[PDB]
């Protein structure tokens, strides 16, 4: 699951990299900045995957009831 | 008769005259609630009317405060 | 692999180019090394990415099987199922090949901001290349409309004197119509609950609901392959867009509309396609005859080629709606052959003359075969190819498309044969004027075609004459793919 | 190698099974391409006879000319969408 | 947590000395309070438990998973707005010190968030009128928070009068409902949903339609948004629609029980008319805020089609659209608050008077932003391209999802008009992109030192001096890539909206 | 759906505090020191005026601690409440709750406590404070009354579960428990 947080972190690097252009500064300015923006989105990316996995469990159970209701309709 | 919008003839040509029409308009809502509540012997309608009178008062105070500062903003030379 | 390698590498390339150019902005003025020679290093990296994109698809062309019916190279990336069949493979090959040529055409004829131009050109090519390899209407539409954002900016930033009118035309014409294609895509998602190609190919709809969806989709197609009376955007945009934007807007963007028929109309709306085919022929035959006659009265050099583009695309639509293999194979070969001859003319007209004299009016140019002989050899050679001379790849496309038109409808489909005569009227008049009489008194003797502009011409002519002499290269890929598009019950 | 056609009909399968439906479409395409290949062979026989007979081409090439003009309308690619989506019995 | 901290901020602010640093520091105390509120809310409130719907405070307030979605959204958008007033939007003391001149700014905002978050939850006509006033009174005060400004005070006076008439219509509908049934609780009214005049609920909607600026009432909203300070317009043109459109959706959920067609025709008459004015209106405008006021009306027209249709796909269309439209709105206004540093300075003709309340006021003040700051110009381009509906941005999926809900319910006429109205509106979104970039190549090599940003002092001349503050830049970049790259996680987000229920169940 | 045993639909305020886990106190402590830190973190992120870090004045840090003192308690209060409602892990509290109630019924005292509030006032109080923690992020409201509408069946405290019989508590029939609805309307049917 680390690769999923790897992608989220790399999105965090892009935002800090895209922030430099808006501020018009060299892309090597304050290298600790890229770490903070990376870790911020891994925290978001960690929670985001928790939210989506939670959605899968809820949606599987709801669909169990929806399939039964359709069968009553399809009688 | 009022379908030709007669009430527009009855509202004066000052910002303060609009404020009064809003109060007279809301006054009709409260009187309607008191009418229903008493006939039904329902105090919940009277709770509503009490809230409407209190809320209609707060609306007046804010509107007048805006109007008052609107007035002094023009008369704001104060260079004497 | 394919799409995943095709997106990730291009995104990496786009990020790399942006990082290199924008590093020095800062608070101080910058005179760096990357600006030297007109951003030459940054233009090179853009040109390499165009060449590498071709290498990605060839890695997957080797694995392609010509005797397998069905989509190959199927993969899922971004919750979207992709894949390739016979028809889609060749159009992808054409799209990526025009990549290096579109960039090379604008090598030293922009006032600046070459890095922005190079990124946009590689971005438009990828978006159009990916449009042939998706497997649902929604994803087709997403890629069909995403090209407006760079193309609208590119034409506005880099355009000619009327670039504001041209930008306001491509953005609104191709959006106010493609939104009608969105409605029919949505209705597919409401009744069937899916927009996947295979899933919707097997469903039959009521003949009233077939007529609605067809009208919506063909509205979005009749603008991209400009059919009269909604063709007014193309001549304007061509005459004002940058030269590289004209190569893509004519080489590829028009062929996305013929591919729109192959995916969105013939398989799933087969019953209602039979009904509209008589009407489609009427619109296309009138497009063929009117566009040819209108070209006879034009004055801008780059408009004249623009209308010649409309006449050929009308023939392509005539062939593809013929319900036989002859018409369908001919229409697709013509789209490939037109995909090289059409860009070549804009190089001759808006890329070689316009980069020397900066005027597109026809009145200034005559007798060009005196002090510019190499230019007049290619103008003569490409004039014939543009008019279906038997040795070129256009004749194979046009003859089959005309043959397929007569097979489908002997009476009115025969009027497609007027394409052979009319195409020689406006075109040969333009060439005969340019390379005839004494050299013009308004121009001044200058260089003939440069070595770069020869390279562009030779590699748009070479593919054209291979397909003409031996078109079975295209056919061996198409045959099993194009045979799944035919609707007929014989008893 | 030489792949064998999956001889399968639209009338014996369930279209819900999109794997079998694919074979019914692929099998109906392959048989048609055989008829064109059969047709191109028959036309070759006609060409030898006419070249070889000369004046007698009307006689020595009588049934080949008759058969070729009979197979021509139906020995062509027609696709599968016609028969998949239509029911001749009804 | 919101209410308790508000009292502490009210008392504390009235004690300490009037200064900008303390005013800006108190604005950073509110940014904590809103953050703390979100952590406590998300802790106790869950989608899995609020699915059934839970009555609170003697059934006055009813909360379910549909309302709960918007409360968290409202809290989030209120964090992104407070970041503007709590940090530097430009860093130039002259332009920025306006945000810190008022100490009750953050207090009034905290008043409104209590008003906004409780409105979707109302379940009694007695508390419906009270809560709608708590939200309505907070907006008038915020519109007049800059009491020195002549235009601001003139707008609050216009806002108060229109809202007062709007609130009276809302109050009169509830009274009429009480007259027929004698019941105040909304659930008790549902027992008589077939026995009451369903048009008295429509008179309730006509009051809520005024407060969201829907035609024919659109006139005042366009005037108000084009007169208030850009920091104020950034709040009052988005927040009321977040909490009122959620309420309108619920009221329409109850209304469609009896499925009265006459009710739907009148609302379709207003939706159809609003698309016309929302599209053709913005064609001939010079002020950017007037342009975004017509843009706002058109998007509200789209969001009502999802509300009017009111099916299972309408929840998904509304829930997704209301989220993406808020982020797009914040992103656009945040950029307009920043790019004012690139305005030129005179050393003449047309005598254009600019003030510190709206330094960026005209569309042609965006000229050559492709030159002065290319990275932020693309961010504005991506944001505008989302409003146009170019895929695969967030804006496309909003229109695509709205169309599904609209056509699935037979609204063919409105679906076609919205697709005509979208293309007509593309003309005036394209003008913003025309001004941003089209004159780049003529101005490429120009001698520019008269910009407002060139009056900033030089600190050291050795260290790197970024032009834009840190926090505002990170917000613009984050919301620009979320708009651009929604295709990556779109499937998860949409499947995360299937679960938001409003008494669907089974 | 993570569901557990419903200990109390409307837990009393004094009960909710007495049931804080050590981790709940940690959250209250973290919230108390988080708000002053968040002010400092912002200054490290971006100075309020000027361009260099400057510690905010001590007065702001005192008001920041108070704001985070309530917020930490509110987060602690809501987390402790989820256990009572069954939304969270409540096995540890269930035994602790059962020990108190079984002891309470044994002494013939009411589990819910004696109340100054009359029957209508008890039931009215329950309506206001039931499910009131869902909006505890907006405004506060606590169950500070000894009412009887807690959403449980007092029969379930008679059966013995694992590890409970060792308590050797004697439970009388509910009809003899002081201050219960089943033990009050003995003379008149409308007066307790
Ligand atoms: C008690 C004094 C007090 O709490 O604060 C001292 C505070 C400081 O006075 P000061 O000397 O002028 O402050 C100068 C500092 O610069 C002012 O700045 P400061 O930082 O030194 O103090 C401001 C204070 C913030 O002040 C408050 O929040 C008081 C809120 C009360 C309302 O922030 C804190 O110090 C936090 C610790 C105390 C807050 C109490 C929170 C729990 C509520 C009790 O004085 C007050 O604010 C008095 C407010 C009390 C009014 C009477 C309320 C009566 C209500 C009950 C009557 C019926 C029963
Ligand atoms: C925008 C709109 C904004 C709206 C919101 C605005 C603000 C409103 C929210 C404020 C609160 C709303 C509720 C107020 C209305 C309800 C008043 C009411 O029910 O009166 C009946 C109630 C009498 O009912 P009861 O049946 O006799 O119940 C007796 C005890 O209340 C309960 O007996 P017990 O079994 O729980 O324990 C007795 C003993 C505790 O016994 C123990 O078990 C020991 C616990 C160890 C100590 C725990 C830590 C103490 C707190 C930390 O003493 C206590 O600690 C009771 C808790 C009260 C302490 C302070 C509560 C502060 C909450 C605020 O009147 C009171 O005694 C209330 C006393 C608290 C004063 C009100 C608190 C707010 C001031
Ligand atoms: C460093 C590690 C990168 C992240 C690796 C990872 O987590 O895998 C996710 C995915 C790999 O692919 P997979 O999981 O097999 O399935 C397809 C899902 N994209 O890989 C990814 O999802 C990365 C793709 C993100 C980059 C593409 C961004 C798309 C931008 C718009 C393209 C235009 C489309 C129209
Ligand atoms: C520069 C060149 C530009 C392009 C070239 C333009 C010419 C191409 C279009 C003309 C195509 C050739 C003419 C079409 C008819 C020739 C085929 C034919 O023989 O038609 C016969 C057919 C039925 O034959 P029949 O047996 O007589 O009818 C009774 C059936 N039991 O059906 C008929 O009876 C047809 C009746 C006569 C044909 C009427 C339509 C002719 C085309 C008029 C177009 C006017 C413009
Ligand atoms: C900052 C953004 C913080 C996002 C926090 C969202 C969140 O925590 O709740 C997500 C919510 C799902 O919550 P729920 O389904 O009710 O159950 C789980 C609760 N524990 O999901 C929801 O339904 C909330 C709906 C609103 C979501 C808005 C999307 C967030 C936008 C991100 C903005 C990022 C801006 C950059 C921040 C820069 C900071 C300097
Ligand atoms: C006790 C209630 C008031 C707290 C006051 C005690 C205090 O924390 O002092 C403030 C602290 C150090 O005091 P200081 O100003 O540096 O010394 C005098 C110099 N003229 O300056 C600081 O650094 C602030 C430290 C705050 C410590 C927590 C304060 C909690 C206040 C109670 C909240 C609940 C009521
Ligand atoms: C807060 C103080 C809490 C301590 C307290 O004094 O309240 C408890 C008190 C209980 O009194 P008690 O006679 O034991 O009730 C049971 C009788 N069957 O409760 C009472 O009887 C009266 C409670 C009054 C305390 C409220 C005063 C606080 C200010 C109100 C705002
Ligand atoms: C100047 C630069 C210009 C632009 C350059 C392009 C940058 C590309 C960055 C690559 C990042 C990457 O790879 O992201 C990979 C990661 C994790 O993917 P995963 O673990 O498989 O999760 C599942 C993904 N599926 C479905 C593909 C399998 O997804 C992301 O973070 C998604 C980006 C965030 C989008 C916003 C949605 C979340 C917020 C919700 C509020 C509405
Ligand atoms: C495959 C899809 C990937 C997604 C790509 C997203 C684009 C964002 C790129 C930002 C980089 C940047 O802002 O950099 C700017 C770069 C390069 O500018 P330059 O000439 O070097 O600098 C100029 C100034 N100088 C020379 C003085 C230093 O130009 C671009 O932006 C070009 C590509 C984007 C244009 C169209 C955007 C439309 C978005 C909607 C599409 C559906
Ligand atoms: C568990 C992971 C937590 C990560 C940290 C989160 C808090 C950030 C504070 C870090 C310290 C700091 O602010 O350091 C300071 C830096 C640099 O500032 P600069 O622009 O160079 O200013 C000039 C600095 N001088 C004075 C030295 C010249 O700021 C940053 O880089 C801010 C990064 C943006 C915040 C990322 C949050 C992402 C949110 C995602 C959820 C939606």
| Residue (of C236, C259, C256) closest to C246 by Cα position | C236
**Beta-carbon separation of E141 and B26 below 8 A:** no
Flag if F78 and E16 touch (Cβ within 8 Å): no
CB E208 within 8 A of CB E247: yes
Beta bridge partners of C300: C361
Hey, how many other C-beta atoms are within 10 angstroms of the C-beta on C10? Answer: 22
E41 CA distance to ligand 2 centroid (A)? 23
Task: Please report the residues numbered 4 through 63 in chain D whose beta carbons come closer than 8 angstroms to any beta carbon of chain C.
Answer: 15, 18, 21-22, 25-26, 29, 32-33
Handedness of CA C237, C238, C239, C244 (dihedral sign): positive
Phi-psi region of E163 (alpha: psi -120 to 50; beta: other; left: phi over 0): alpha
Please list, residue by residue across C284-317, b when 16 or more beta carbons sit within 10 angstroms of its beta carbon and e when fewer do: bbebbbbbbebbeebebbbbbbbbbbbbbbbbbb
Residue C76 phi/psi, 5° resolution?
Answer: -115, 125
Which residue of chain B has the CA closest to E172? Answer: B29
Q: Quote the radius of gyration of chain F (alpha carbons, Å).
A: 22
Q: Is the dihedral of CA B66, B72, B74, B76 positive or negative?
A: negative
Inter-chain contact B62–E137, Cβ cutoff 8 Å?
yes
Cα C78 to middle of ligand 3, angstroms = 6
What are the φ/ψ torsions at residue C392 (nearest 5 degrees)? -90, 170
Our answer on whether the CB atom of C411 is closer than 6 Å to any ligand 4 atom is yes
| Of the candidates B12, B13, B16, B11, the residue with the CA atom closest to the CA atom of residue B70 | B16
The two three-digit tokens of residue E36, written as one number: 């703390």
- What DSSP string runs through C171-189? HHHHHHTHHHHHHHHHHHH
Q: Is C202 in Cβ contact with D33 (below 8 Å)?
A: no
Min distance C245 CA to chain E CA atoms (Å) = 16
Interatomic CA distance for residues E150 and F181, integer angstroms = 65
Report the C-alpha gap between E354 and E13 in whole angstroms. Answer: 32
Chains C and D touch (3+ CB pairs under 8 A): yes
| Contact yes or no for E164 and B59 at CB 8 A | yes
Nearest-CA distance A70 → chain C (Å): 15
DSSP E strands in C184-282: the ranges are none
Sorted by sequence, the CB contacts under 8 Å of residue C76 that are 6+ apart come out as C82
Query: What is the CA(C80)–ligand 3 centre distance, in A?
Result: 11
Q: Do B55 and E133 touch (CB under 8 A)?
A: yes
Give the CA dihedral C321, C324, C325, C330, nearest 10 degrees. Answer: -40
**Inter-chain contact C176–E404, Cβ cutoff 8 Å?**
no
Question: Tokens standing for E356?
Answer: 């510190």
CA distance E22 to E142: 20
Compute the nearest-CA separation of E216 from chain B (Å): 17
Ligand 5 center–CA E76 separation, angstroms: 7
Peptide bond into C229 cis (omega under 30): yes
State the closest ligand 2 atom to the C-alpha of F147, by its place in the atom list counted from 1.
26
A22 in contact with chain C, both atoms CB, cutoff 8 A: no
Q: Which numbered atom of ligand 1 lies nearest the CA of F63?
A: 33
Instruction: Report the separation in Å between the CA atom of C410 and the middle of ligand 4, taken as the mean of its atom positions.
Output: 8
Centre of ligand 6 to C-alpha E23, Å, is 20
In this structure, the number of other CB atoms found within 10 A of the CB of residue F91 comes to: 10
Contact call for residues C323 and C277 (beta carbons, < 8 A)? yes
Nearest CA residue ID for atom 3, ligand 5 = E76
Residue A30 Cβ inside 6 Å of ligand 10? The answer reads: yes
Could you tell me where the DSSP H helices lie in E448-498? Answer: 470-484, 490-495
B25 vs E contacts (CB less than 8 Å): 165, 168
In terms of C-beta density within 10 A (0-12 exposed, 13-18 middle, 19 or more buried), how is residue C99 classed? buried
Determine the Cα–Cα distance for residues E289 and E291; give it in Å rounded to an integer: 5
Contact at 8 Å (CB) between C90 and C337?
Answer: no
In b/e form, how buried is each residue of B60-77, taking b as 16+ CB within 10 angstroms? eebbebbbebbeeeeeee
Residue F120 at interface with chain E, using a CB cutoff of 8 Å: no
At residue E388's C-alpha, the angle toward residues E384 and E390, to 5°, is: 100
Residues of A with CB under 8 A from a CB of E: 11, 14-16, 18-19, 21-26, 29, 37, 48, 51-52, 55, 58-59, 62, 65-66, 69
E377 lines ligand 9 (CB under 6 A): no
Q: Which residues of E touch B70 (CB under 8 A)?
A: 153-154, 157
Cα C129 to Cα C126: distance, rounded to the nearest angstrom:
5
Residue C241 DSSP symbol: S
What gap in Å lies between CA C296 and CA C294, rounded to an integer?
Answer: 5
In angstroms and rounded to an integer, the radius of gyration of the C-alpha atoms of chain A is 21
Report how far residue E90's alpha carbon sits from residue E97's, in angstroms, rounded to the nearest whole number.
10
Q: How far apart are CA F149 and CA F119, in angstroms?
A: 11
Q: Give the chain C residue nearest E400 (alpha carbons).
A: C186
Instruction: Return d(Cα F82, Cα F5) in angstroms, integer.
Output: 11
3-state SS, one letter per residue, for C22-81: HCCCCCCCCCCCCCHHHHHHHHHHHHHHHHHHHHHHHHHHCCCCCCCCCCECCCECCCCE
CB C301 within 8 A of CB C427: no
CB contact under 8 A, E499 and A62: yes
Of B14, B54, B12, B47, residue with least CA distance to B33: B47
The burial of E130, by beta-carbon neighbours within 10 Å (0-12 exposed, 13-18 middle, 19 or more buried), is given as middle
Q: Distance between CA atoms of E127 and E144, rounded to whole angstroms?
A: 26
Pocket lining: F118 vs ligand 2, CB cutoff 6 Å: no
Contact C153 E416 (CB under 8 A): no
Smallest CA–CA distance from D26 into chain C, residue = C69
Instruction: Answer whether C425 contacts ligand 9 (Cβ < 6 A).
Output: no
């Amino acid at each position: 699951m680390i690769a999923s947080l790897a992608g989220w972190g790399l999105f965090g690097v892009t935002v800090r990299a895209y922030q430099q252009g808006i501020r018009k500064v060299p892309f090597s300015y304050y290298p600790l900045g890229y770490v903070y923006s990376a870790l911020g989105w891994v925290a978001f990316g960690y929670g985001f995957n928790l939210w989506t996995e939670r959605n899968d469990k809820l949606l599987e159970k709801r669909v169990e009831k929806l399939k039964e209701s359709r069968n009553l309709r399809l009688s | 008769m009022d379908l030709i919008l007669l009430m527009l003839v009855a509202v004066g040509l000052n910002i303060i005259d609009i404020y009064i029409m809003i109060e007279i308009l809301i006054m009709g809502c409260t009187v309607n609630t008191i009418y229903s509540a008493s006939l039904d012997n329902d105090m919940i309608g009277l709770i509503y009317s009490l809230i409407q009178i209190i809320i209609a008062g707060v609306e007046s105070a804010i509107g007048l405060s805006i109007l008052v500062n609107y007035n002094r903003i023009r008369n704001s030379e104060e260079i004497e | 692999m394919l799409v995943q390698n095709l997106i990730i590498f291009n995104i990496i390339g786009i990020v790399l180019l942006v990082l290199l150019n924008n590093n020095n902005n800062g608070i101080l003025n910058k005179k760096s090394l990357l600006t030297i020679k007109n951003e030459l290093k940054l233009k090179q990296i853009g040109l390499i990415i165009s060449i590498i994109n071709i290498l990605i698809i060839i890695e997957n062309w080797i694995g392609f099987n010509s005797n397998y019916y069905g989509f190959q190279n199927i993969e899922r990336f971004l919750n979207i199922y992709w894949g390739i069949d016979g028809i889609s493979l060749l159009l992808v090959l054409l799209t990526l090949i025009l990549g290096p040529i579109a960039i090379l055409s604008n090598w030293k004829n922009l006032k600046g901001y070459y890095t922005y131009y190079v990124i946009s050109i590689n971005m438009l090519v990828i978006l159009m290349a990916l449009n042939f390899i998706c497997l649902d209407l929604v994803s087709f539409y997403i890629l069909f409309e995403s090209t407006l954002a760079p193309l609208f900016l590119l034409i506005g930033i880099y355009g000619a004197n009327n670039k504001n009118k041209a930008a306001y035309y491509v953005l609104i014409y191709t959006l106010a119509s493609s939104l009608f294609m969105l409605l029919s895509i949505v209705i597919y998602y409401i009744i069937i609950n899916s927009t996947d190609y295979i899933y919707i190919n097997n469903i039959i709809l009521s003949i009233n609901l077939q007529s609605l969806l067809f009208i919506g989709i063909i509205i979005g197609i009749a603008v991209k392959t400009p059919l009269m009376p909604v063709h007014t955007w193309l001549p304007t945009v061509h005459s004002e867009s940058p030269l590289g934007g004209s190569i893509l807007l004519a080489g590829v963007i028009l062929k996305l509309a013929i591919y729109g028929v192959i995916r969105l109309l013939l398989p799933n709306l087969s019953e209602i396609s039979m009904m509209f085919t008589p009407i489609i022929y009427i619109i296309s035959i009138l497009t063929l005859i009117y566009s040819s006659l209108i070209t006879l009265k034009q004055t801008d050099l780059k408009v004249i080629i623009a209308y010649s583009s409309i006449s050929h695309l009308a023939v392509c639509m005539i062939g593809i709606f013929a319900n036989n293999l002859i018409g369908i194979n001919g229409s697709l070969i013509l789209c490939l052959a037109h995909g090289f001859v059409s860009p070549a003319l804009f190089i001759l007209v808006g890329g070689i003359l316009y980069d020397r004299y900066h005027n597109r009016l026809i009145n200034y140019y005559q007798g060009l075969s005196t002090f510019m002989p190499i230019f007049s050899i290619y103008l003569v050679v490409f004039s014939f190819c543009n008019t279906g001379t038997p040795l070129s790849g256009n004749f194979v496309g046009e003859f089959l498309s005309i043959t397929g038109a007569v097979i489908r409808h002997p009476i009115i489909g025969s009027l497609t044969a007027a394409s052979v005569l009319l195409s020689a009227c406006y075109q040969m008049k333009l060439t005969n004027r340019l390379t005839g009489s004494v050299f013009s008194q308004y121009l001044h003797i200058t260089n003939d075609v440069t070595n770069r502009e020869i390279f562009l011409l030779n590699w748009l002519l070479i593919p054209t004459i291979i397909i003409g002499i031996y078109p079975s290269f295209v056919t061996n890929i198409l045959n099993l793919a194009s045979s799944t598009l035919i609707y007929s019950v014989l008893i | 190698d030489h792949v064998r056609s999956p001889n399968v009909s639209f009338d014996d399968i369930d279209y819900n099974n999109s794997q079998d439906l694919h074979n019914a479409q692929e099998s109906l395409l392959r048989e048609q391409w055989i008829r064109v290949s059969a047709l191109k062979v028959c036309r070759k026989a006609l060409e030898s006879c006419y070249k070889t007979s000369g004046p007698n081409h009307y006689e020595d090439c009588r049934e080949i000319a008759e058969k070729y003009l009979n197979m021509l309308p139906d020995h062509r690619i027609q696709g599968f969408l016609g028969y998949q989506k239509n029911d001749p019995s009804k | 947590m919101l209410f308790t901290s508000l009292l502490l901020i009210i008392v504390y602010g009235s004690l300490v000395n009037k200064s900008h640093l303390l005013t800006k520091l108190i604005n950073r105390l509110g940014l904590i309070i809103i953050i703390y509120t979100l952590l406590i809310h998300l802790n106790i409130n869950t989608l899995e438990n609020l699915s059934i719907g839970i009555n609170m405070f003697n059934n006055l307030l009813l909360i379910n998973s549909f309302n709960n979605t918007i409360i968290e959204l409202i809290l989030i958008i209120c964090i992104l707005y407070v970041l503007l007033i709590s940090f530097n939007i430009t860093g130039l003391s002259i332009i920025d010190n306006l945000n810190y001149s008022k100490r009750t700014f953050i207090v009034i905002v905290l008043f409104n968030i209590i008003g906004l978050t409780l409105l979707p939850l109302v379940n009694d006509i007695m508390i419906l009128f009270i809560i709608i006033e708590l939200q309505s009174y907070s907006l008038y005060l915020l519109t007049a928070i800059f009491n020195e400004s002549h235009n601001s005070t003139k707008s609050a006076l216009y806002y108060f009068i229109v809202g007062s008439i709007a609130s009276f219509i809302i109050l009169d509908a509830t009274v009429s409902i009480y007259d027929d049934l004698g019941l105040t609780n909304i659930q008790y009214i549902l027992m008589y949903i077939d026995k009451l005049e369903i048009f008295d609920l429509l008179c309730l909607l006509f009051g809520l339609f005024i407060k969201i600026g829907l035609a024919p009432f659109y006139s005042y909203s366009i005037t108000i948004y084009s007169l208030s300070p850009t920091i104020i317009t950034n709040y009052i043109s988005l927040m009321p629609k977040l909490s009122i459109l959620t309420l309108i959706y619920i009221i329409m959920h109850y209304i469609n029980i009896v499925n009265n067609t006459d009710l739907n025709y009148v609302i379709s008459f207003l939706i159809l008319i609003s698309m016309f004015i929302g599209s053709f209106g913005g064609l001939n405008v010079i002020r950017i805020k007037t342009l975004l006021a017509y843009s706002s009306l058109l998007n509200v027209s789209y969001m009502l089609l999802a509300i009017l249709s009111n099916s299972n796909e309408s929840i998904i269309a509304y829930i997704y659209y209301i989220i993406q439209y808020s982020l797009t709105h914040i992103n656009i206004f945040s950029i307009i608050l920043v790019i004012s540093i690139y305005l030129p300075i005179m050393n003449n003709m047309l005598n254009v008077m600019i003030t510190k309340y709206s330094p960026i006021e005209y569309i042609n003040q965006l000229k050559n932003l492709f030159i002065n700051n290319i990275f932020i110009a693309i961010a504005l381009c991506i944001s505008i391209f989302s409003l146009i509906g170019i895929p695969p941005l967030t804006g496309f999926y909003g229109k695509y999802l709205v169309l599904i809900s609209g056509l699935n319910n037979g609204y063919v006429l409105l679906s076609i008009v919205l697709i005509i109205a979208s293309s007509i509106s593309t003309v005036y979104y394209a003008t913003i992109l025309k001004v941003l970039s089209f004159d780049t190549l003529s101005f490429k090599d120009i001698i520019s030192n008269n910009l407002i940003i060139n009056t900033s002092p030089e600190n050291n001349n050795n260290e790197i001096k970024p032009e834009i503050s840190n926090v505002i830049s990170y917000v613009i970049s984050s919301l620009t890539l979320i708009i651009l790259l929604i295709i990556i996680q779109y499937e998860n987000i949409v499947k995360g909206a299937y679960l938001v229920l409003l008494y669907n169940w089974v | 759906m993570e569901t557990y045993e419903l200990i109390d639909s409307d837990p009393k305020f004094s009960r909710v505090v007495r049931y804080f886990r050590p981790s709940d106190y940690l959250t209250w402590a973290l919230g108390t020191i988080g708000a002053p830190g968040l002010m400092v973190l912002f200054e490290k992120i971006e100075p309020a005026k000027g361009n260099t870090f400057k510690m905010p004045p001590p007065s702001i840090m005192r008001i920041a601690t108070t704001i985070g003192f309530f917020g930490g308690f509110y987060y602690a209060y809501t987390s402790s409440t989820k256990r009572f409602w069954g939304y969270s892990e409540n096995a540890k509290e269930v035994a602790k709750d059962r020990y108190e109630v079984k002891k309470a019924l044994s002494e013939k005292k009411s589990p819910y406590g004696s109340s100054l509030l009359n029957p209508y006032q008890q039931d009215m109080s329950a309506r206001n404070s039931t499910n009131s923690q869902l909006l505890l992020a907006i405004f506060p409201w606590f169950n500070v009354a000894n009412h009887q509408s807690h959403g449980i069946d007092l029969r379930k405290y008679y059966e013995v579960r694992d590890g409970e019989e060792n308590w050797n508590f004697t439970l009388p029939p509910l009809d003899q428990v002081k201050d219960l609805d089943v033990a009050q309307y003995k003379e008149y049917s409308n007066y307790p």
